[PDB]
Design a protein around this ligand. Sequence first.
Ligand SMILES: C[C@]12CC[C@H](O)C[C@H]1CC[C@@H]1[C@@H]2C[C@@H](O)[C@]2(C)[C@@H](C3=CC(=O)OC3)CC[C@]12O
Length: 130
Amino acid sequence: SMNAKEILVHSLRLLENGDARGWCDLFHPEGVLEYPYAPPGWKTRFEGRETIWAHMRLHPEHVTWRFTDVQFYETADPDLAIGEYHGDGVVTVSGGKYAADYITVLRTRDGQILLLRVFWNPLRILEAAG
Ligand SMILES: C[C@]12CC[C@H](O)C[C@H]1CC[C@@H]1[C@@H]2C[C@@H](O)[C@]2(C)[C@@H](C3=CC(=O)OC3)CC[C@]12O
């Protein structure tokens, strides 16, 4: 099955497709999603596939995303990936823009995600959403 880097690039393509169900299905049932720099007001951790789903569920209808090519650092374990990439987000009703630079840590096992730890600058969110 897929290694961490192939799962990251496939997870991004899923999001660009609006396919939240499939994105969430990549996680291990006890999969963890983390936003370590999220703003106060926001949860920085979502434990378990269903919890991640309950958060991601709602957004494809309202915002869509396009990511540049991931550049990966060379980790020793093929079940760990660490990557940098740029996302542009578009709010579907207004044409409102998000622009973000990520560095993301991904731990996989047997094709499923145990941990997706997604860093980005929460100023990018406060400027676009307030
Ligand atoms: C919190 C967030 C903020 C912007 C908008 O309100 C949509 C929400 C939902 C979903 C969330 C964005 C921030 C974004 O930067 C994300 C973290 C971004 C991701 C990057 C990635 O690797 O996985 C998810 C896509 C969409 C995202 O999952």
